[PDB]
Amino acid sequence: AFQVAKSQEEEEHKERMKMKKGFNSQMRSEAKRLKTFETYDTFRSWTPQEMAAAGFYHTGVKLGVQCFCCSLILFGNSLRKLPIERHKKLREEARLESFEDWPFYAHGTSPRVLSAAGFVFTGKRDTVQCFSCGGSLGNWEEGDDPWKEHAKWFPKCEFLQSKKSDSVFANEELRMDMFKDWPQESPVGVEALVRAGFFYTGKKDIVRCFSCGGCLEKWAEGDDPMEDHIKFFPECVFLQTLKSSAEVIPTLQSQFQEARSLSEQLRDNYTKATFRHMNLPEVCSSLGTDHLLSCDVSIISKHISQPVQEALTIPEVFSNLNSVMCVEGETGSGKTTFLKRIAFLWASGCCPLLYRFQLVFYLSLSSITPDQGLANIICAQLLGAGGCISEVCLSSSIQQLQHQVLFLLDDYSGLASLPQALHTLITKNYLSRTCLLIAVHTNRVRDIRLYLGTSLEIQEFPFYNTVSVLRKFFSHDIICVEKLIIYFIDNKDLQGVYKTPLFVAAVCTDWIQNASAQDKFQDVTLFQSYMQYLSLKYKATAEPLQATVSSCGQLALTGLFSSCFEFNSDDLAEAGVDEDEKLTTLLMSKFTAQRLRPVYRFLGPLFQEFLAAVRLTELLSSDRQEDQDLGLYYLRQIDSPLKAINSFNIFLYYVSSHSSSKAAPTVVSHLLQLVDEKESLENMSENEDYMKLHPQTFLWFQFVRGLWLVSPESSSSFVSEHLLRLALIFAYESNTVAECSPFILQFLRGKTLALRVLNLQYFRDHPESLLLLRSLKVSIFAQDEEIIKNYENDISEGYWKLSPKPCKIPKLEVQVNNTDAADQALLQVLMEVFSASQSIEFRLFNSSGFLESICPALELSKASVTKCSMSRLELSRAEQELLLTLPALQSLEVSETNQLPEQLFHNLHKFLGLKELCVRLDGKPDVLSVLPGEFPNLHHMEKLSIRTSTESDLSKLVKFIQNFPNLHVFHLKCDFLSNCESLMAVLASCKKLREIEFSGRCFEAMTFVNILPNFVSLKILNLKDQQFPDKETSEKFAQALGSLRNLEELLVPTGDGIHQVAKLIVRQCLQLPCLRVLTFHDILDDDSVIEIARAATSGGFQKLENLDISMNHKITEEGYRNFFQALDNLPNLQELNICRNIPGRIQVQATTVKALGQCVSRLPSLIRLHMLSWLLDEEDMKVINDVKERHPQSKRLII
Amino acid sequence: MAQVINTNVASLTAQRNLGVSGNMMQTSIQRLSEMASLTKNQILQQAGTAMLAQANSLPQSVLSLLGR
């Protein structure tokens, strides 16, 4: 918004203090312009041609132009500000050929007053345009005041106001006396120009020699005084007495009435006005040409011995002309547009070498092979070739005036040796010292290559050409042009599909003849319309035109099959025969120079994927013998869900066209076939091509790997968002809404969904069935901001516009962060969705300014609230009275503040339903007083997590905590308890003690060897640092833990209980199944990891995944043996910490540690190894890197 | 005058706060002289600053691409 104005001060003022220098007598030369307005960076959306003719000038740095009238630097050329117009707001033959085609109709207004008022006639029915307006119109009525009509038709033309509002001196002192009138714009040495033998005349830069009469052009600021007069006047007699024929050799290495009147007749005929016509406005038929009304391309000039020589321009063709030359491109398109460009603009004469070219000859040889020369085709497709002058005498008029004859030969690819004078002219090209051109495609450049000096390639510059054509021809609609240019940086490979600039007429009909793209502008509509043009152009039946479509479609199946793009030309079992149909169709071509077996090339590599999409609907809604087993075959070769987002986004979004739906349930069944997988990560990351958002696709892998890095359910939640999103677009656009609906209900269930409804018209078909999701989620970390970027590549808008009366809306989820305000509009959105949903899940994360938000939130809401998380609040009284007065609360977690809630506590002991607490860092000996108010209420409790700073009253705790029937996970920790008898009573008088967290309370564990035998079905046990000797706790906890084979997660602390406890305990935990987590912190000296070594050799361990050997005494080659077998033979483990021995543990024998990295790489199913508290080097970085890349199933090595 | 700009540069203000998350990377290199928190912040928030880095010069590409 403002950052373009402040940044406009930044780079515009930084450039304003930089490059003010302007030599406003120098910058008028054309050749230095189109030379240096060609080969610069060119990343904008603006044509360099008429910006070199805008009145400004620029070098080639980032777009900073200057001028002579308004001298200011201007850069950052962006949309819709035409720089010829922005020049204003920031401050003979054409008229002759015009009225030549003058019809009979328009004579209520005279044509000569149209001649005296600046009008140009375009050779159609009575339509005009000015030389610098661009609008050809008819609509002729009576009283049309012509220049005032030009100010009254349309206000587009600012050329309206921009235009409306010697014989006695034959000595070098008298010649030099004429040279003392020297023009300022020439910094060339004047004295050498005096000694060059000229004298001045009186105009700009022409100059008149006295010996022969040399005057001529190419006079600029950095030229040579002698060179042009030598190499372009080699017969000046004073120069002959100055530099003779042996001295013009370095400049040589630097650079009849029937014949004449024949040249006058053919010169009068080759300036044809109706020759302009092209079917580039084919059915659109817009009143306009293709040079003054269309932009251009450039030349990839390539040398014959493989350097890519230059990228010349169209006047740079004229500078060093080629006596015989070939160009590659597209027939119908640019190449014949280049030839008819040469002839039609050769009927204009603006370039300073024009009007002196003699005889061009346009020819298209695709029609003929007529075994007869000039009179056949000049008398056939043109007017005539003369009868008094013979056809060989016409060829004698060629071979008598050869040096300025220019040829425009087309399509030797459809030509053999059958025309006589033609093919013998081409094979004997010396015998006419002429300029020959030819426009053969890249299938048959080899037959021309014997007669070539350099090759020329036509190439589109889709930076600016597509927005010039769609600018000028579609100024009627410019907001979709804004959609195009904003789409150019949302999709930065938009140049990767615009590959031919004169087959954008399908886009032209897809704006003026198909208005659907104006509200549906993404890619597949556009090149779907291009494919529809490929059905319209060469309209035919089910020939191998159509089997060229399908057969090159399975060439595209080989294209994305093994990711092969530039082919081998071996397997032509897909397409094969009649190459003229495939190159005439132009879906492919082949290699130019030598290969061993030559190489096929495409017009567009990503366009090939759209060909494979045509192949996929061909293999989706057609004969079901084995064809859809081929589409099913490759469609099952792509079966990994993390690859599905990007690869199925681009390619399956190409499949999102072609709505036929005869096996769309099979491909959305492949979308349901994607289940919870891990190897999909490097299934995508191993692949090579990524299509449009290519380094961004690398970033998609990085961020989704970051999603699985933290949260497995948020990663799969984003997977659910993209799978349900693209499956929703494909489902609604495929119209399989009642055909696949309960299968989509299988595609919904169990997945937790964050609320995204702005593609609501795809979703609102039947939301009641589409309503049984597992969860609903809103938050306010950076994930939802990236999702804002993802649609950017609302809630109640799509949600109530979705359903006017929602029904039975499921439960909800809230996260809030510390940067949240209290805007009431989103609180009204919360009023709507809380009025809709069942109940709320609610998470407070440091949210200040939420007291002023929780007052209107609970004010608007009613008493239906389940979960509240109280992460680091302010703990004020009024908002917890307002939270307090709502019944049916079920969940409240309180673990943060040293400040203790009192009214919320003792008044939280009133209601019913509550099952979640927490009491971390509070401190209470006496706060338990109205807790016996809760004691009649709730036998419904599912989370208990207590901390006190000292001893509380325990009789109430043993009483009603004894009165619990529905035990659960417990978190208990950290006070001066000193009472194992009350806790022995309550833990001895209960039933369901199967998830116990007793991490580090001051306590004597004599109870646990009594109450652990009372309950056998325990699954999770956590303990932090206690007293733990090696015969009392080792024998008694060897029995008590020995009879406890139901456990899954084990956290044992901090004892001098020594390796006998590893014998019996590592024995029994070795010999129990259903076990996942295991932790031996502050214990396991090296003989105890001998016990995990010899124990871990035999097995019985294959269920385990998580394991911690933090805090050994010393790991060394001992640990290489023990972690060799123990980190070898156990193919399910994934967790390891070796750390916090912090000062100096490089006593590990580092190369044997590299062998231990070989040993960890033996383990397939590992994820996180933590190799902390020793030095690495460069070497083991390369070692754990390279052996990490052996199987990439792991990702978490932590230094 | 495109008006896809105002809350998008309050969003770019937040993206400059991901530049302040670049200063949180400077905090992490400042804080050298368990660590799964630093693992998920450096790797995950580095991926977020990459997404909003191409998507922070990407609205700079908007302003350097829209005609004003």
- What Cα–Cα distance (Å) separates residue A203 from each residue in A25, A181, A217, A222? 15, 11, 12, 20
Residue from A709, A818, A1169 to probe the interface with B (highest B Cβ count within 10 Å): A709
CA distance A362 to A818: 74
| Residue type at B54 in one-letter notation | Q
Instruction: For Cα atoms A830, A834, A839, give the angle at the middle one, nearest 5 degrees.
Output: 135
User: In this structure, is the dihedral angle defined by the CA atoms of residues A34, A36, A41 and A44, taken in order, positive or negative?
Assistant: negative
- Residue A1139 contacts B where some CB pair is shorter than 8 Å: yes
**Residue keyed to tokens 């307006």:** A133
Helical H segments across A399-522, by residue range = 420-426, 446-449, 465-472, 479-490, 505-512
Q: Do residues A1080 and A1052 make contact, with C-beta atoms less than 8 angstroms apart?
A: yes
Q: How many CB atoms lie within 10 A of CB A1143?
A: 5
Which tokens sit at A91? 């401050």
Q: Do residues A1127 and A1100 make contact, with C-beta atoms less than 8 angstroms apart?
A: no
User: Are B14 and A785 an interchain contact pair (Cβ–Cβ within 8 Å)?
Assistant: yes
Q: How many CB atoms lie within 10 A of CB A624?
A: 11
CA distance A730 to A671: 11
Nearest to A1082 by CA among A1133, A1006, A998, A1141: A1141
Do the annotations mark residue A853 as ligand-binding?
Answer: no
Residue A775: φ, ψ to 5°: -150, 165
CA distance A1118 to A1089: 9
Judging contacts by C-beta atoms under 8 Å, the chain B residues touching residue A2 are 9
Resolution (Å) of this entry: 5.2
Q: Do residues A206 and A216 make contact, with C-beta atoms less than 8 angstroms apart?
A: yes
Pairing status of strand A207-209 against strand A198-200: antiparallel
Helix (H) / strand (E) element for A1020: namely: strand A1020-1024
CA distance A90 to A84: 10
Computed on alpha carbons and rounded to an integer, the radius of gyration of chain A in Å comes to 42
Which tokens sit at A141? 């009525």
User: Are A486 and B9 an interchain contact pair (Cβ–Cβ within 8 Å)?
Assistant: no
Give chain A's end-to-end CA distance (angstroms, integer). 44
| Residue type at A1089 in one-letter notation | V
Q: Which positions ≥6 away from A189 have C-beta within 8 Å?
A: A225
A410: left (phi over 0), alpha (psi -120 to 50) or beta: beta
Question: In 3-state terms, what secondary structure has residue A299?
Answer: strand
Judging contacts by C-beta atoms under 8 Å, the chain B residues touching residue A45 are 65
Q: Do residues A868 and A840 make contact, with C-beta atoms less than 8 angstroms apart?
A: no
Strand partners, A325: A437
Q: How far is A76 from chain B (nearest CA, A)?
A: 6
> Per-residue b/e over B9-37, b at no fewer than 16 CB within 10 Å?
bebbebbeebbebeebeeeeeeeeeeeee
Judging contacts by C-beta atoms under 8 Å, the chain A residues touching residue B20 are none
Helical H segments across A619-735, by residue range = 627-636, 641-654, 664-673, 680-685, 694-710, 712-734
Strand partners, A406: A360, A435
Instruction: Say if residue A468 is exposed, middle or buried (CB neighbours under 10 Å; 0-12, 13-18, 19+).
Output: buried
Q: Which positions ≥6 away from A238 have C-beta within 8 Å?
A: A197, A209, A210, A211, A212
- For the sheet with A1135-1137, list strands across it: A1135-1137, A1168-1170, A1196-1198
CA distance A1072 to A1056: 25
Residue of B nearest to A1 (CA): B5
Longest alpha-carbon distance in chain A: 135
Instruction: For Cα atoms A490, A496, A501, give the angle at the middle one, nearest 5 degrees.
Output: 110
CA distance B59 to B66: 10
- What Cα–Cα distance (Å) separates residue A193 from each residue in A31, A180, A197, A236, A352? 22, 11, 7, 15, 21
In total, the C-beta contacts within 8 angstroms joining chain A to chain B are 95
Nearest to A560 by CA among A665, A634, A481: A634
CA atoms in the 13 A half-sphere facing the CB of A49? 15
A569: left (phi over 0), alpha (psi -120 to 50) or beta: left
Which tokens sit at A627? 């064809």
CA distance A950 to A178: 112
Q: Do residues A555 and A588 make contact, with C-beta atoms less than 8 angstroms apart?
A: yes
Q: How far is A79 from chain B (nearest CA, A)?
A: 4
Instruction: For Cα atoms A538, A542, A548, give the angle at the middle one, nearest 5 degrees.
Output: 70
Residue A766: φ, ψ to 5°: -150, 80
Strand partners, A1107: A1078
Helix (H) / strand (E) element for A553: namely: helix A546-561
CA distance A296 to A877: 74
Residue of A nearest to B35 (CA): A1198
| DSSP annotation string for A612-638 | HHHHHHHTTSS-TTTHHHHHHHHHHTT
| DSSP annotation string for B2-65 | -SS-HHHHHHHHHHHHHHHHHHHHHHHHHS----HHHHHHHHHHHHHHHHHHHHHHHHHHHHTT
Which tokens sit at A1067? 């024995």
Pairing status of strand A1020-1024 against strand A995-999: parallel
| DSSP annotation string for A783-826 | HHHHHHHHHH--HHHHHHTT-SS--SB----EEE-TT----HHH
Residue A139: φ, ψ to 5°: 60, 35
Residues in chain B: 68
Q: Do residues A454 and A303 make contact, with C-beta atoms less than 8 angstroms apart?
A: yes
Which tokens sit at A1152? 């044997």
Residues in chain A: 1199
Q: Do residues A1064 and A1095 make contact, with C-beta atoms less than 8 angstroms apart?
A: no
Q: Do residues A553 and A612 make contact, with C-beta atoms less than 8 angstroms apart?
A: yes
| Residue type at A217 in one-letter notation | E
Which residues 996-1015 of A have a C-beta within 8 angstroms of B? none
Instruction: Write the residues followed by a gap in chain A (C–N more than 2.5 A).
Output: 91, 165, 255, 780, 793
HEC profile of A919-986: ECCCCCCCCCCCHHHHCCCCCCCCCEEEECCCCCCCHHHHHHCCCCCCCCEEEEECCECCCHHHHHHH
Q: How far is B26 from chain A (nearest CA, A)?
A: 19
A285: left (phi over 0), alpha (psi -120 to 50) or beta: left
CA distance A681 to A700: 11
Solving technique? cryo-EM
Q: Do residues A560 and A552 make contact, with C-beta atoms less than 8 angstroms apart?
A: no
Residue A686: φ, ψ to 5°: -75, -25
Nearest to A890 by CA among A853, A917, A929: A917
Q: Tell me which DSSP letter residue A46 carries.
A: S
Do the annotations mark residue A441 as ligand-binding?
Answer: no
Q: Which positions ≥6 away from A743 have C-beta within 8 Å?
A: A665, A668, A669, A672
> Per-residue b/e over A766-787, b at no fewer than 16 CB within 10 Å?
ebeebeebebbbbbebbbbbbe
User: In this structure, is the dihedral angle defined by the CA atoms of residues A291, A294, A295 and A297, taken in order, positive or negative?
Assistant: negative
**Residue keyed to tokens 């057969």:** A551
| DSSP annotation string for A1132-1189 | T--EEE----TT----S-HHHHHHHHHHHHH-TT--EEE--SS---HHHHHHHHHHHT
Do the annotations mark residue A212 as ligand-binding?
Answer: yes
Q: Do residues A452 and A325 make contact, with C-beta atoms less than 8 angstroms apart?
A: yes
Q: Which positions ≥6 away from A107 have C-beta within 8 Å?
A: none
Q: Tell me which DSSP letter residue A81 carries.
A: -
Q: Which positions ≥6 away from A996 have C-beta within 8 Å?
A: A970, A1018, A1020, A1021, A1022
Q: Do residues B43 and B60 make contact, with C-beta atoms less than 8 angstroms apart?
A: no
Q: How far is A615 from chain B (nearest CA, A)?
A: 34
CA distance A127 to A629: 58
CA distance A55 to A74: 12
Do the annotations mark residue A434 as ligand-binding?
Answer: no
- Residue A90 contacts B where some CB pair is shorter than 8 Å: no
- How are the residues of chain A apportioned to helix, strand and coil, as percentages rounded to the nearest 5? 40, 10, 50
Nearest to A410 by CA among A448, A372, A376: A448
Q: Which positions in chain B have a beta carbon within 8 angstroms of at least one beta carbon in chain A?
A: 2, 4-6, 8-9, 11-12, 14, 18, 34-36, 39-40, 43-45, 47-48, 50-52, 54-55, 58, 60-68
Strand partners, A1002: A976
